[PDB]
Design a protein around this ligand. Structure first.
Ligand SMILES: *[C@@H]1O[C@H](CO)[C@@H](O[C@@H]2O[C@H](CO)[C@@H](O[C@@H]3O[C@H](CO[C@H]4O[C@H](CO)[C@@H](O)[C@H](O)[C@@H]4O)[C@@H](O)[C@H](O[C@H]4O[C@H](CO)[C@@H](O)[C@H](O)[C@@H]4O)[C@@H]3O)[C@H](O)[C@H]2NC(C)=O)[C@H](O)[C@H]1NC(C)=O
Ligand SMILES: *[C@@H]1O[C@H](CO)[C@@H](O[C@H]2O[C@H](CO)[C@@H](O)[C@H](O)[C@H]2NC(C)=O)[C@H](O)[C@H]1NC(C)=O
Ligand SMILES: CCC(CC)O[C@@H]1C=C(C(=O)O)C[C@H](N)[C@H]1NC(C)=O
Ligand SMILES: CCC(CC)O[C@@H]1C=C(C(=O)O)C[C@H](N)[C@H]1NC(C)=O
Ligand SMILES: CCC(CC)O[C@@H]1C=C(C(=O)O)C[C@H](N)[C@H]1NC(C)=O
Ligand SMILES: CCC(CC)O[C@@H]1C=C(C(=O)O)C[C@H](N)[C@H]1NC(C)=O
Ligand SMILES: *[C@@H]1O[C@H](CO)[C@@H](O)[C@H](O)[C@H]1NC(C)=O
Ligand SMILES: *[C@@H]1O[C@H](CO)[C@@H](O)[C@H](O)[C@H]1NC(C)=O
Ligand SMILES: *[C@@H]1O[C@H](CO)[C@@H](O)[C@H](O)[C@H]1NC(C)=O
Ligand SMILES: *[C@@H]1O[C@H](CO)[C@@H](O)[C@H](O)[C@H]1NC(C)=O
Ligand SMILES: *[C@@H]1O[C@H](CO)[C@@H](O)[C@H](O)[C@H]1NC(C)=O
Ligand SMILES: *[C@@H]1O[C@H](CO)[C@@H](O)[C@H](O)[C@H]1NC(C)=O
Ligand SMILES: *[C@@H]1O[C@H](CO)[C@@H](O)[C@H](O)[C@H]1NC(C)=O
Ligand SMILES: *[C@@H]1O[C@H](CO)[C@@H](O)[C@H](O)[C@H]1NC(C)=O
Ligand SMILES: *[C@@H]1O[C@H](CO)[C@@H](O)[C@H](O)[C@H]1NC(C)=O
Ligand SMILES: [Ca+2]
Ligand SMILES: [Ca+2]
Ligand SMILES: [Ca+2]
Ligand SMILES: [Ca+2]
Ligand SMILES: [Ca+2]
Ligand SMILES: [Ca+2]
Ligand SMILES: [Ca+2]
Ligand SMILES: [Ca+2]
Ligand SMILES: [Ca+2]
Ligand code: NA
Lengths: 387, 387, 387, 387
């Protein structure tokens, strides 16, 4: 058992091969499946797991009523093996949480679960399931974190948290965590930027995060930093705008794009020099479809020209959150950090006529062998009996 | 595999971080979850587990009827991982039981399960699941034990059992157990005191139990003892009365407080010199709400002043039993024994219009980092389909 | 990993302490629990498991119809941990079977599953889940075996099978099995005896079996043998008759007792010199109640006097099959082979008005510490929804 | 962990002993069991597993509707222990897949899952659950593979895939795979032959596959090859025709038998010099019944005489796909590779009045000890509540 090095570079990839699909909402029509949202995948050196925030309720049961609501004392962070439906009969309990992150350092799992009131929430940190630290709201306004895996390099794990309004300037902090203990934190000097729900990955011993600007950006903000949390900030320049909502593609910007910039969705991108692989919704106005786009100058260039598009979910199908996850050399035997991604397929409120909201997931891993575009949607037939 | 030392002091703590919530009643509306009461938590050097008394029945099925009744031949002690719902599909069988205790000495689990008739019940003790001893009622009036973890120091484990009436003087025995074999017991000389449902923990090689006076005490009795079962007795002196029911807070006593003293609820407290961390309901008359209070002179002083209160369950929400559990340094890597606690959130009879009674649970661990009060209640909407 | 020696003697016991209870029929009212009959318990050096023959159907579902029927191609031998309900979500598959045995030699499990036609059934033998032998019907008339654990001594396991009519002379064979291969078999010369559903245990390197005489005996037949299968035969002499049905107690006999001798129930007894611990039903006419009786001269003496009676199930409660199981020193750390027993609590047809028949279980281990009689019945309220 | 040698010969067998039956459809009347088809069994050096293609839906739920359809984005390759029902609570996720194969090389599991569109499907290969390679359709017409285990010899695993029309000449490729990487493939020169759904097994370091001619053969095509993918081709010569549909038995041919040759069913056979063990349906026109036949000159001789027949499923009962699996010496301790087989028992559409199609399974292993013919059918009573 050894710490993940995290010192190799990301594997360059040409396409995305399908890795998992859980069908949770379809199975939940009869089976005992948690109502969940905000799922994500994270791997150890031995396995990949899906983490998710339950609503303390099963699908097709009356307790799923009102699960559009984001924060309650019932919500818990749990995990199961990748591609299995999240059930009380296969799910490991992690934390009481309405916002979370998790990652494995090579030795044990770090989990971060935030609960408590909007005016004073507390992140509880656990290492191997023992509480090892806490951090409390410093702006008293919905302390919130990634909803995806943290990133680890040589025994240190890193995450981003946000505290403040969701329609204006907020405060953003970056953390270094070792064996579940916060050993350093810094508050970002980022005037006119906004960051939340960051998707962060390791790459050549450094951390890159691509986040959501809910304030006034239709492109995605990024922050990268080293083990000492010395950081750099920007927005993805590509005119292939990554957020949802967003305008139609056109010339981009290296700061925040204000057009359709308010609101957003969690997402990700991978940086390869001046190029970028963007995952995004296919619809500009709602969480519908999903596609991956390789723009070989999109990190720093502002044109809307790109070279590869691979379909993942069809434009008439419900999508949702998406996030990065990696497979390290210690897991794969490769000489590089493999990029993967998951997509959350949201069903129910607000877009459908149900009492509940819940998601399934799909996930894909980067390869340089042949791949194909298609649509792998949630597949459930709504409404359900309970509705 | 090594014996827990049990020789360090209790970790000093400033507040309580949420550790687990299982949502059992919410989930059992649809899923297959045991009807249970008398849950508790106990840890080995490798994991923590929820122990509970089943009713041999599942939520929202007809055999849930009558489960207000405490003692039957159908009740079984079973256990599942912390924060998971207790289900037939995830629960390990421990013992046939309508009163129980369990604790891990560092090598194997000890379990104590009392079944049989009210006039001659028998505790069956198991070590690693094998029957290693029995002990029979010696007063023929409902032999009963902790309903929370026993406590272990250097390969010996300790518990308390009571036999006799619940509305007057009863008999109270302390036991030293090694590899599931009773090696010593003493009957306590405790005239005008009453002990049941003790929450016992180790602290610097000695055991301290805080219990329930069902006879005539609205404050809690305590007994502390060494590995030779040489014991000291007393009641918590604080005017912050710990039992339910109780009077409003006023000047306390170091003997039993007779005002509102009859009846009770299982609870716990932690001694820190002359100070005390008290867990109690928020209502003085029913099992509603829960709070943690630090009273720096409350173990020995009778005033009703305290220095810290942390809300756990709101006053208008159902609560129930509570107990202590510890995390030893062999589990955590700390230099001290960490105090934690669980609360049972009882739903159904006698307070609600159901045919059944069952609980869910929440637990917290003591920390010195930032924490917050809130309410994490059961959350189920009663009555259910079967009612 | 080492072979069970099997060379110590049975632990003398003074009473029976309750070990497990599954509540399967109560739980199966809503949960996903197999319809089963013919359960039994068997232990390895690490754990005890319950084996059972499913009917390829779940309780309270339409496929449980007609499960009074003994033999079908749907019936399977499965196992789960002791005291858990048998569900498809916790159950290990063993063999396709309508009659069975299993036992662990210290290294691996042996399972014996008989299926196929009444006129040519085949026992399939498996070691560690691999098929290692078969034995086919030699009288073409329902080849059948113990429905309880086989017995192992020094790497050899032993069982008994029967082939022929159930209302007359049949044929009875004894088998020695090593690593799942039949290494010797003998046909018993036992004119005027009848043996089936033998409960067999090791004791001082030899096997004792106590069986069912369905032809013309209301006491139980026995056969004991060494590793070479050189055997002796007799019937339990005590006037405390062990079978069901049977007459009221009176002077017994050392050969078959013809009064109420046709028909029967699987059962067991333990021999301790000239004395016997007898488990039997409390009713003389039907499968109701259960009790254990220590008769200090009952193996070889014919009087109906006895020393100890311990109630297990009350006379107005349903019982059923019962069988021996042992815990070897390699499991317990004792210097003797510990005797235990289980009882099948049968519900449904033919005594109740249901479409199905299915059983739960209770089990007890022998101890020399204090015990108590009680009733631990099945507890389900019939009929069920499906009826 | 050591690589399976795969260099010994097939064990000679006189008959087939029943190994497993899962009763999936019967159990899924109430419990949470996947709608599935295309099951198959494959073994590591430590256990045997059932692999199957789910429909992303449970039996007796509305999302089972339309499951006659073969290919969708919801289908997933998943696995559970042999003989257990495939449930979301006991099944391991393998791959997104509407056509599949898997096999264990002695060190790790290889899985092959084809998803994507009919005009450009992609097989995703995983080794130990990590994506190790992909291969894309090369004729753009439903890339498809074995629906049974691939075959392994000294660290290399072999499979066959087909691409093109199912009512005419298509293209057939053989693959050598090492640690989940395709290291060699060849396209077969096979004019006038047709191969799909190959059942492949190792025998003396070489692979023999018996497949389905959906174009114009009522006998089965075979291809055998060495580790270099040097291959020989042929059809089974026996006038005991192996496909469904087929003619009644008459003189066979060593080329495709065109009488009733169109359409087909996945099946298997085992070669023993000039002889052959044939598994087939009992009906000549529909997937009903199953029997095993030993024809001592049937691999190369065209007569319709055989030496042994062993009933498996009766003629009036539903059957389906069948395939081979092996137990290598590293698992059994034998000196030869043991042949086994499974049969899928298909229920629902198109033959029955349901909204859904699903299968259960049975399997058998080859022995030289005594065996018996019988019928072990699915057993479920259709239609179901949902229909
Ligand atoms: C939760 O649990 C409670 C407590 O048990 C249930 O309340 C019981 O409900 C049952 C069923 O309704 C009651 O049992 C019934 O009693 C009837 C009347 O019994 C008395 O009066 C008759 C004369 O009419 C006398 O013959 C008899 O000796 C009694 O003095 C009976 O008529 C019913 O009998 C029928 O069913 C039985 C099954 O054994 C048949 O054998 C009979 O022939 C007959 O067909 C029946 O026994 C019982 O009294 C209630 N108990 C209490 C304490 O009130 C709740 O119903 C339950 N709730 C839910 C939701 O399940
Ligand atoms: C339920 O089982 C009954 C019997 O209890 C079924 O009736 C027939 O099939 C059985 C085969 O197992 C036999 O046991 C019966 O003797 C036989 N004939 C009868 C009762 O006349 C009956 O068809 C089944 N019920 C349902 C709902 O299908
Ligand atoms: C709290 C503001 C933030 C951005 C608007 O809300 C997020 C939006 C969500 C969304 O856009 O779907 C779902 C997240 N669960 C929620 N996070 C929390 C902590 O409640
Ligand atoms: C036996 C008397 C005792 C104190 C009143 O009853 C306890 C009270 C209970 C309670 O106050 O909720 C529930 C406990 N399950 C019960 N213990 C037993 C062994 O039945
Ligand atoms: C086969 C005759 C035998 C004795 C009457 O029947 C047994 C009786 C039974 C019984 O008396 O309850 C149940 C057993 N499952 C059955 N065994 C078999 C193989 O069917
Ligand atoms: C694609 C052609 C092929 C042969 C007709 O269809 C198969 C026939 C099937 C059948 O005959 O039952 C079911 C298989 N699931 C299907 N394979 C695929 C990949 O869909
Ligand atoms: C990465 O870290 C490993 C393990 O410590 C080290 O041996 C190696 O020199 C470093 N870099 C690369 C790119 O392999
Ligand atoms: C959902 O909650 C609303 C408002 O509290 C209520 O009207 C409705 O009955 C609920 N539906 C269900 C199925 O519980
Ligand atoms: C990794 O961390 C360890 C322990 O802090 C340290 O010894 C080592 O130098 C670090 N390696 C790098 C490349 O930073
Ligand atoms: C506690 O016990 C340990 C382990 O036996 C021993 O080595 C140590 O000296 C003791 N520590 C304290 C704080 O008393
Ligand atoms: C712990 O127990 C062992 C065995 O009884 C004993 O030798 C040792 O002295 C004990 N340690 C203490 C500190 O009591
Ligand atoms: C039992 O067998 C053990 C282990 O082989 C042996 O050491 C011992 O002598 C035997 N005991 C008796 C009483 O025969
Ligand atoms: C037990 O079996 C082994 C191996 O056959 C043999 O060597 C040994 O003598 C046997 N022991 C006894 C006590 O018979
Ligand atoms: C097969 O291979 C094994 C292991 O490599 C070797 O030892 C043996 O000689 C070979 N066996 C046969 C039957 O050829
Ligand atoms: C099944 O699917 C068909 C086609 O969409 C539809 O017409 C039918 O109503 C569905 N039936 C059920 C019972 O859901
Ligand atoms: Ca935005
Ligand atoms: Ca560009
Ligand atoms: Ca009191
Ligand atoms: Ca005070
Ligand atoms: Ca008899
Ligand atoms: Ca006597
Ligand atoms: Ca259910
Ligand atoms: Ca054909
Ligand atoms: Ca021939
Ligand atoms: Na009956």
């Amino acid at each position: 058992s050894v710490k993940l090095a995290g010192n190799s570079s990301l594997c360059p990839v040409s396409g995305w091969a399908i890795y998992s699909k859980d069908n949770s909402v379809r199975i939940g029509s009869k089976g005992d499946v948690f109502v969940i949202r905000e799922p994500f995948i994270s791997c150890s050196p031995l396995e990949c797991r899906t983490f998710f925030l339950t609503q303390g309720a099963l699908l097709n049961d009356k307790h799923s009523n009102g699960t559009i609501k984001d924060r309650s004392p019932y919500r818990t962070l749990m995990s199961c093996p990748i591609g299995e439906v999240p059930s009380p009969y296969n799910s490991r309990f992690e934390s009481v949480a309405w916002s979370a992150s998790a990652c494995h350092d090579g030795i044990n799992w770090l989990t971060i679960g935030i609960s408590g009131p909007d005016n004073g929430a507390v992140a509880v940190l656990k290492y191997n399931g023992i509480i090892t630290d806490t951090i409390k709201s410093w702006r008293n306004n919905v302390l919130r974190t990634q909803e995806s895996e943290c990133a680890c390099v040589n025994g240190s794990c890193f995450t981003v948290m946000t505290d403040g309004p969701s329609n204006g300037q907020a405060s953003y902090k970056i953390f270094r965590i070792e064996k579940g203990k916060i050993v350093k934190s810094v508050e970002m000097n980022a005037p006119n930027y906004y960051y939340e729900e960051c998707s962060c990955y390791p790459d050549s011993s450094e951390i890159t995060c691509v986040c959501r600007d809910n304030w006034h950006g239709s492109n995605r903000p990024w922050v990268s930093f080293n083990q000492n949390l010395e950081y750099q900030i920007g927005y993805i320049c590509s005119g292939i705008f990554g957020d949802n909502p967003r305008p139609n593609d056109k010339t981009g910007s290296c700061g925040p794009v204000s057009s359709n910039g308010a609101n957003g969705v969690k997402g990700f991108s991978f940086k390869y020099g001046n190029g970028v692989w963007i995952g995004r919704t296919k619809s500009i106005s709602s969480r519908n479809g999903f596609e991956m786009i390789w723009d070989p100058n999109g990190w720093t260039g502002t044109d809307n020209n790109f070279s590869i598009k691979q379909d993942i979910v069809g434009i008439n199908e419900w999508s949702g959150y998406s996030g990065s996850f990696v497979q390290h050399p210690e897991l794969t035997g490769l000489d590089c950090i493999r990029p993967c991604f998951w997509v959350e397929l949201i069903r129910g409120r607000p877009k459908e006529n149900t009492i509940w909201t819940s998601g399934s997931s799909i996930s894909f891993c980067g390869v340089n062998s042949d791949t194909v575009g298609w649509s792998w949607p949630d597949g459930a037939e709504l409404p359900f009996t309970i509705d």
